[PDB]
């Protein structure tokens, strides 16, 4: 079925893009702390330029942090649609197979193709769990951490785990 094939088609592309976005963020969080530290190491009015530089680095970090959650939250939701569409189908296969044992015709869809889809769908959720786990470590960049950003990762980490719990029970 193309709707599946195309659904898991773009998931590859978009989690790759996410992985790149997370690397972009990580790279920039190093920039900020470097500039922040340099600014703290010791006035010359030139320091105004030095502070304006640090000030502009935190805004990118803040902008990126919010743009990463938007990405992964869209993926979490998409993975849900896929799971919510895959598992009921396998359920229909188990039924149609059980009936085949008491005189029904075999199911049209092979189990080999279903298992591949559930494995590919799971491989995305484990990958995404690893990426959220990285962002949770980046959240510890500073003391207050980022109470809103940290909760966004925690809240998505729960959803990703509920999707896995679904997939790992019936597979």
């Amino acid at each position: 079925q193309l709707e599946i094939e195309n659904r898991i088609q773009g998931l590859h592309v978009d989690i790759e893009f996410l992985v790149r976005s997370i690397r972009q963020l990580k790279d920039e969080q190093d920039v900020f702390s470097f500039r922040y530290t340099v600014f703290s190491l010791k006035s010359d009015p030139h320091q105004s330029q030095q502070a304006q530089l640090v000030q502009a680095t935190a805004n990118k970090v803040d902008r990126m942090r919010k743009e990463v959650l938007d990405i992964s939250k869209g993926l979490v939701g998409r993975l849900t649609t896929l799971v919510d569409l895959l598992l009921p189908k396998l359920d229909e296969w188990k039924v149609q197979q059980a009936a085949s044992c008491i005189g029904a015709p075999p199911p049209e869809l092979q189990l080999e193709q279903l298992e591949q889809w559930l494995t590919a769908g799971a491989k995305f959720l484990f990958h995404l769990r690893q990426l959220l786990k990285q962002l949770k470590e980046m959240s510890h960049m500073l003391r207050y951490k980022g109470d809103m950003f940290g909760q966004g990762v925690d809240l998505q980490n729960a959803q990703v785990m509920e999707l896995l719990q679904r997939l790992l029970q019936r597979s």
Partner: protein, 165 residues
């Protein structure tokens, strides 16, 4: 020390005793990387010269990854090493030690200072000390351990003040 002071960074890449490039970086910051990455970074990225012979230098540059951060402002030169490649360094602010001075990972190191440069310079002109130093060399190592890459650093205001006499 006038306001119109040129604190621009002057890099000089050296590969095995050969000068392979010079780069003036007019920005407060820069990152020295093998190849420029496709990302939206507020900080400038300065690529290492691509080795023409290709070896053994290329094998070394491909391990930089995050690279090196250099900050050249009014207070002098600062560096932070983000790569697994070991880096030794010699600069006016190096401590008095026997062995090599190695950049520590996750720690901003102060290479050069304008405050003490002006101080030690005012003492020479008057005649109570030697002239100040300003070059901040960086040596990269590769695997036995050989110093394949060398990068010299200096600020424009420094050499301009001394070379007058």
């Amino acid at each position: 020390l006038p306001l119109n002071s040129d604190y621009s960074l002057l890099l000089t890449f050296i590969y095995g005793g050969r000068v392979v490039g010079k780069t003036q970086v007019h920005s407060l910051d820069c990152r020295l990387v093998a190849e420029r990455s496709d990302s939206e970074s507020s900080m400038e990225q300065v690529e290492f010269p691509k080795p023409d012979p290709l070896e053994p230098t290329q094998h070394l540059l491909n391990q930089l990854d995050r690279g090196v951060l250099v900050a050249s402002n009014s207070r002098g030169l600062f560096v932070q090493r983000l790569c697994p490649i070991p880096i030794s360094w010699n600069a006016p602010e190096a401590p008095p030690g026997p062995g090599p001075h190695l950049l520590p990972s996750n720690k901003c190191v102060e290479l050069f200072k304008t405050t003490y440069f002006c101080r030690d310079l005012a003492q020479y002109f008057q005649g109570q000390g030697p002239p100040p130093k300003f070059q901040a060399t960086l040596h990269f190592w590769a695997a036995s351990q050989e110093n394949l890459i060398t990068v010299q650093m200096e600020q424009a205001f420094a050499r301009h003040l001394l070379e007058k006499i």
